Design a protein around this nucleic acid. Structure first.
Ligand SMILES: Nc1nc2c(ncn2[C@@H]2O[C@H](COP(=O)(O)OP(=O)(O)OP(=O)(O)O)[C@@H](O)[C@H]2O)c(=O)[nH]1
Ligand SMILES: [Mg+2]
Lengths: 21, 95, 49, 707, 48, 31, 14, 13, 360
RNA sequence: UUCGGGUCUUGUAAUUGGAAUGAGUACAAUGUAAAUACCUUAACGAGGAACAAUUGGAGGGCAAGUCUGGUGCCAGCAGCCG
């Protein structure tokens, strides 16, 4: 559809987290 | 609460030295100028000019290799958002 | 119209820039230039430091 | 402490403030038009249809509002209306959730000075389960609270029942936007700007026929004013967003079409429309004059008033004889200089002491102003504003027009010349035509040094010499930026790209704006090719302005060894002649292994070779390299976007990106194979044993001998 | 301490130019210092 | 001759930079 | 140094 | 052993 | 190349205002009716000075020398030296610098070499004590004019270092509406290569005239001899009346001519200063144009200065007409309520003008 | 603490199986003044189980890179920049 849903990145907004487990 | 006057050590050469991390803000309930840390020269970039920074105490526990003494304050929020928030890219500095 | 002529001129300039940006770099703008790569006997006029 | 702040100035009139401006923004099919029509019909008891262009209504005795349904797919319209707006009714689909147009607009606002955002959520009546409804409202609210501040409230709107939203929720929205209480922002309170209400072309139709529908027609523009008193003397520069950068020919103020009832009744009071309470035109239903009379000589001015070169400094005096004879005495200036008898002596002593001390400790202003440096600064500001007020009130015709010009909220018409026929032809009502008075710094051109970072949500980094349509000031234009780093503040080296997660310096050509000014740049203003990706690409602030820069790109020359002794080496393949080498003699040359050097003398028989000394026996396989710098230059491209002139008003196509042209021309991304990286695996090296000279080995004593 | 992983990212090691498989294994600082220490050792014992 | 000039100017600039940095750190400590 | 650092020019004609 | 020596140098200093 | 100006009138003022505004100007018919029509050596060197201090400007000059075209750039400044031709002195070459100093990208450190006094142009002590105070009142703090070597006509060989460090953003608006009260009379009586007896003679003449008053007077003698005293001999005096309450100064100076009488010059300048006091209203007639320019460039607000009808003169008239031609900024004049005198407040809406060249 | 000492089925971003279940969504009923939940529950719903948990603290390493100082080849500051 012509609507542009937001990316998961910008939905969740976990900016810069290190690697974890 | 303070106003960023000028960034000291803009012209210093080795990056991430204390005189890079320092700025100079005037506390607004006195009109009184005091200097203050900021981690991460990147954050030095996040804070620029006439910004209404929110300062907190430093409370360092042990000295470092080249820490400037006599600089007791650290910048916490800039123009109303958190420095760590901006730095981690959670938020964006609203002008 | 004046705007239309201006857009024609801007189009010419755009075409120039497009071809320039897709074309090959200058020997100078490259890095790690080698004696046969660059034009013969050019440094003594290029005057770099 | 919380209630302290950074003192600023509020250049808005107390007297007849203009209609505040509310921009209704969001995705395409999201009840935006219905929202405006329902708000209007609540606030003025009149259902409306065929809404377009700024629509101005009045609320309360002292407020009035300007609604702009901004178009739902124009990035340029988003940018400029966000520059200008005051309250953003930012609205969100409910069943769908946040949308990229909303996120993009919010970012633009954040970077250009955030107006009072205020979110409303629609399509809430399509949720089947009240549980999913509640969870979804809460999630929207919290994500919104991240973008706009926290505690910011959004409104919820169930379905349209009769082409209108429920009266209760709208009533609450209306009262909120009736006590909104806006706040000062630097750009708006430093520039004059208006949002045009009506547009009228002006030529003579026979003249149009003769010139052939090509002559650049005069244009009249009607609207209120905002921000800073427009100077009334014709010939100032105003940028019309998306149309160009004009200069005003003729100014004139008029009676406003929707005067607030307080003003109307005060007017009726002084002298001694209730049915059309809205306004949608774009929709359908003496020494001073002696000074400034130019045809008069200054001699004539002065003789009439009483009844010369300026290069010389000393002013014109009389003969010393007359001077001394006149002033044998000084009593005429003694005034300027400085029981009953005892009281008079006390009074004159008090006068002497007051002249002595005076304003040395006149209250310190501090205990006067409640011992808070913030409030002291603010008091200075307010005292200045009231001085302005009284001096302006002093006199009617000039203090209002010639001195300051039209303050704000003064409904003016302006006519320009030389306005494109394309504008007048393709102009539709659904787009905002906004005007801003420029400043000298903003009419000059040069190159601006800013610092910018890749916008955190844009998936790709920004290459140098790739066009960026940036928005800065009132303007939107496409430019060729160059991104520079300072190698620890020795020199300004160009980078090949943008650091993924940090701010790099950039320098680019374009109109100048005052330092410390924020700006934001996009890549694709064309609606035709946007994709699902995030549009805004770079954000930064301009630091300094100039007309040229020293900007350096590194190039290293590579040379090759072919005959080596201890500490000396013959290097071939690095220059092309002995003159060249001799020009370069005495150079810090270092090899890949990291051993320093210099080039000593140009070798003779081979044409370019040379001998160089190193700090250690270089290999044969190594490579010698010489670091040197090369000046680059900034491209002077400048292609200001003009979507309003364009007919589609979207898909403004400018310079294309490098990857785009490469794909279009069907080339390949060039890469020489020797530059790539590889997974090498370094093996151990066994070194040979020592071998003493036979002379020594024969001369050794018997014990310390190799047995 | 207060540093991004991208700030700590990596730096790959470029290898010898292709036109010289004849002169293999372009030398880097680790190997140069290893050989330099070895040669200094030999010089020391010869002086002895 | 160019090399002589370049050495001269670099030494002048490094001197200026060291002077400025000493000034700034002293101002930090005393202000 | 002077030609490398300056940008604007004076045009003198007589 | 070298890694422990470096660790010990760090710990002392 | 757009705004037209006629005649050689107020050439430096017009060029200064062109730089400050930014719009391009064009001055035509410079001394058309002359045996040597066109500019002069000093004007040409002044254009050279502007080109040095600024950056990106363009100066077009006619082959006839009768018309000049100016398309400005931005102010930079930096460090420089200038060789003022002997036709005019350094005061003439410094005043425009006083106008353009504190809005530059870099501080001003300019070394002027030439003659350092004349009858028509402000001297060194004149500039210091009569214009630095006005700048300080308007906001500039760190402005100084050191005098390395002090020349004199007609050989000069004097040197002055002009340093300005207060890079303000724009002058503070001014509110002065009351005639100040003179506190003291300071003065400088200098000379080069002649008798301190001559200097003291000047001092005695001036104090002789001024004994009638009761305000204290202190005049410092400044005698120079030897090598750093310049080539030709000379002498001069400069008197300032200082109102210490708010820091205001009215000054008048002059220099001795070949075969002048030291006491006669002293009495002349004393009477002359006290004349300027009589005519003055919060500002001297010679300081006035500086004050007006700073008001018109102060930020977007109303500033007020109390002037006198005597300071209202044809020089003031032409100044205000040029200012309107440049800035479109009318100046309102309002008579004071005072019945005794006839002072008029000059009220000016300074346009918002920012030191947009300075880096952050 | 350095010389060294002790001890032992452990190691891996290796392959692979068929099971369990609620977060969620949902006929229904229960609940309730009416509902929304909870508690029960048909049909759905798990292999990056992408159905994507965090907030701090400590340390290392990498380059034809950068800066600064030196009794070569080193040391320091540091390194999103080759
Ligand atoms: N169910 C439901 N439908 C809504 C709601 N609000 C709007 N709509 C639908 O959306 C349509 C309204 O679109 P518009 O009023 O034109 O809003 P718009 O942004 O101007 O849409 P465009 O004309 O495409 O720009 C109506 O036909 C409604 O059917 C809502 O709250 N609930
Ligand atoms: Mg619609």
């Amino acid at each position: 559809d012509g609507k542009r849903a937001i990316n998961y990145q910008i939905l969740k907004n976990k900016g810069l987290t290190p690697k974890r487990n | 609460k303070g106003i960023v006057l000028e960034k000291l050590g803009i012209e210093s050469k080795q990056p991430n030295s204390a005189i890079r991390k320092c700025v100079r803000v005037q506390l607004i309930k006195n009109g009184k100028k005091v200097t203050a840390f900021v981690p991460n020269d990147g954050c030095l970039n996040f804070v620029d000019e006439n910004d209404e920074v929110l300062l907190a105490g430093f409370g360092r526990k042990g000295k470092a290799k080249g820490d400037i003494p006599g600089v007791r304050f650290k910048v916490v929020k800039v123009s109303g958002v958190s420095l760590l928030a901006l730095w981690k890219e959670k938020k964006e500095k609203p002008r | 119209s004046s705007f239309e002529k201006q857009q024609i001129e801007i189009r010419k300039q755009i075409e120039q820039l497009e071809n320039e940006a897709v074309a090959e770099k200058k020997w100078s703008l490259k890095g790690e230039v080698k004696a046969k790569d660059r034009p013969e006997d050019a440094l003594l006029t290029e005057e770099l430091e | 402490e919380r209630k302290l702040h950074v003192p600023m100035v509020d250049r808005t009139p107390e007297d007849d403030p203009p209609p505040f401006i509310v921009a209704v923004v969001g995705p395409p099919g999201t009840g935006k038009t219905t929202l405006i029509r329902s708000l209007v019909r609540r606030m003025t008891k009149s259902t409306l249809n065929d809404i377009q262009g700024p629509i101005t209504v009045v609320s309360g005795k002292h407020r009035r509002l300007t609604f702009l349904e901004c178009p739902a797919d124009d990035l340029n319209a988003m940018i400029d209306i966000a520059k200008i707006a005051d309250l953003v009714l930012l609205l969100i689909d409910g069943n769908f959730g946040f949308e990229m147009e909303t996120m993009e607009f919010l970012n633009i606002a954040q970077h250009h000075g955030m107006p009072r955002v205020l979110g409303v959520a629609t399509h809430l009546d399509l949720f089947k389960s009240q549980s999913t409804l509640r969870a979804s409202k809460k999630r929207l609210k919290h994500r919104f609270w991240t973008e706009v501040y926290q505690g910011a409230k959004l409104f919820y709107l169930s379905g349209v029942i009769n082409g209108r939203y429920p009266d209760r929720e709208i009533l609450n929205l209306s009262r909120f936007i009736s006590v909104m209480k806006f706040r000062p922002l630097k750009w708006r309170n430093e520039h004059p700007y208006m949002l045009a209400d009506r547009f009228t072309d002006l030529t003579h139709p026979e003249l149009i026929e003769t010139q052939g529908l090509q002559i650049d027609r005069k244009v009249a523009i009607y609207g209120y004013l905002h921000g800073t008193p427009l100077p009334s003397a014709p010939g100032t520069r105003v940028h019309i967003a998306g149309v160009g950068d004009f200069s005003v020919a003729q100014i004139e103020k008029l009676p406003d079409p929707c005067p607030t009832p307080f003003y109307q009744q005060k007017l009726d009071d002084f002298e001694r429309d209730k049915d059309k309470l809205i306004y949608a035109p774009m929709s359908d239903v003496n020494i001073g004059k002696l000074i400034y009379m130019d045809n008069i000589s200054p001699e004539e001015c002065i003789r009439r008033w009483r009844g010369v070169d300026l290069e010389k400094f000393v002013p014109y005096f009389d003969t010393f004889e007359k001077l001394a004879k006149k002033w044998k005495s000084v009593d005429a200036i003694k005034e300027r200089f400085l029981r009953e008898m005892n009281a008079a002596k006390k009074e004159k002593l008090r006068a002497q002491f007051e002249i002595e001390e005076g304003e040395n400790f006149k209250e310190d202003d501090e205990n006067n102003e409640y011992d808070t440096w913030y409030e002291l600064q603010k008091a200075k500001i307010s005292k200045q504003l009231e001085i302005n007020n009284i001096e302006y009130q002093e006199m009617t015709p000039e203090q209002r027009q010639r001195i300051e010009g039209f303050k704000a909220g003064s409904y003016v018409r302006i006519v320009f010349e030389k306005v494109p026929m394309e504008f007048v032809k393709n102009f539709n009502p659904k787009f905002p035509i906004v005007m801003g008075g420029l400043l000298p710094t903003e009419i000059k051109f040069g190159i601006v040094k800013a610092r910018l970072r890749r916008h955190r949500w844009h998936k790709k980094i920004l290459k140098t010499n790739d066009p960026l349509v940036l928005s800065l000031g009132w303007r939107r234009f496409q430019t060729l930026p160059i991104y520079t780093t300072t190698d620890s503040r020795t020199r300004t080296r160009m980078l090949k790209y943008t650091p993924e997660h940090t701010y790099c310096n950039a320098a680019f050509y374009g109109p100048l704006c005052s330092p410390n000014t924020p700006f934001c740049g996009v890549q694709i203003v064309a609606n035709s090719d946007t994709g699902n990706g995030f549009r805004i690409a770079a954000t930064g602030i301009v630091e300094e302005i100039d007309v040229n820069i020293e900007i350096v790109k590194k190039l290293k020359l590579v040379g090759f060894p072919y005959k080596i002794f201890k500490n000396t080496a013959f290097i071939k393949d690095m220059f092309s002649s002995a003159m060249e080498v001799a020009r370069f003699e005495g150079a810090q040359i270092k090899t890949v292994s990291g051993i320093r050097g210099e080039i000593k003398r140009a070798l003779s028989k081979p044409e370019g070779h040379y001998r160089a000394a190193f700090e250690d026996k270089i290999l044969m396989s190594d490579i010698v390299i010489l670091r040197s710098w090369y000046p680059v230059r900034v491209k002077k491209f400048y292609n200001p976007v003009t979507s309003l002139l364009l007919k589609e008003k979207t898909e403004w196509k400018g310079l294309r990106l490098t990857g785009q042209i490469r794909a279009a021309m069907n080339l390949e991304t060039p890469s020489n194979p020797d530059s790539a990286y590889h997974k090498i695996e370094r093996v151990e090296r066994h070194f040979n044993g020592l071998k003493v000279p036979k002379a020594v080995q024969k001369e050794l004593p018997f014990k310390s001998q190799i047995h | 301490k207060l540093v991004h992983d991208v700030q700590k990212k990596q730096h790959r090691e470029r290898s010898q130019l292709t036109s010289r498989s004849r002169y293999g294994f372009l030398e880097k600082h680790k190997d140069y210092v290893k050989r330099a220490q070895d040669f200094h050792r030999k010089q020391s014992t010869l002086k002895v | 001759f160019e090399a002589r000039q370049r050495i001269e100017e670099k030494n002048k600039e490094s001197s200026d930079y060291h002077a400025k940095m000493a000034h700034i750190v002293n101002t930090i400590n005393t202000e | 140094k002077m030609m490398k650092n300056k940008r604007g020019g004076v045009i003198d004609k007589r | 052993r070298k890694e422990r020596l470096k660790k010990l140098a760090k710990m002392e200093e | 190349k757009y705004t037209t100006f006629q005649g050689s009138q107020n050439f430096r003022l017009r060029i200064v205002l062109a730089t400050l505004s930014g719009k391009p100007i064009k001055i035509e018919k410079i001394r058309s009716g002359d045996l040597n029509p066109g500019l002069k050596d000093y004007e040409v060197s002044f254009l050279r000075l502007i080109e040095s201090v600024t950056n990106g400007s363009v100066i077009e000059i006619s082959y006839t020398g009768t018309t000049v075209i100016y398309r400005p750039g931005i102010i930079v400044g930096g460090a420089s030296t200038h060789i003022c031709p002997s036709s005019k002195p350094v005061g003439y070459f410094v005043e425009p610098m006083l106008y353009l100093a504190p809005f530059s990208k870099k501080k001003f450190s300019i070394l002027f070499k030439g003659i350092t006094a004349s009858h028509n142009d402000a001297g060194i002590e004149a500039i210091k004590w009569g214009l630095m105070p006005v700048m300080e009142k308007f906001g500039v703090r760190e402005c100084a004019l050191h005098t390395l070597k002090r020349g004199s006509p007609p050989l000069g060989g004097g040197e002055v270092h002009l340093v300005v460090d207060s890079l303000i953003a724009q002058p503070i608006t001014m509110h002065e509406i009351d005639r100040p009260i003179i506190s003291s009379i300071t003065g400088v009586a200098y000379s080069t290569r002649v008798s301190p007896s001559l200097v003291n003679r000047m001092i005695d003449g001036a104090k002789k005239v001024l004994k009638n008053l009761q305000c204290e007077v202190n005049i410092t003698a400044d005698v120079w001899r030897g090598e750093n005293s310049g080539k030709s001999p000379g002498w001069g005096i400069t008197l300032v009346a200082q109102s210490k309450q708010k820091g205001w100064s009215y000054f008048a100076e002059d220099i001795g001519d070949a075969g002048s009488i030291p006491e006669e010059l002293g009495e002349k300048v004393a009477c002359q200063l006290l004349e300027e006091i009589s005519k003055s209203a919060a500002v001297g007639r010679n300081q006035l144009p500086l004050a007006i320019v700073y008001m018109v460039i102060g930020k977007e607000d109303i500033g007020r200065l109390r002037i006198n009808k005597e300071q209202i003169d044809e020089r003031f008239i032409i100044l205000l007409r040029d200012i309107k031609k440049i800035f479109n900024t009318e100046v309102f004049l309002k008579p004071v309520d005072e019945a005794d005198n006839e002072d008029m407040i000059a009220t000016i809406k300074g346009i918002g003008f920012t030191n947009t060249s300075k880096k952050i």
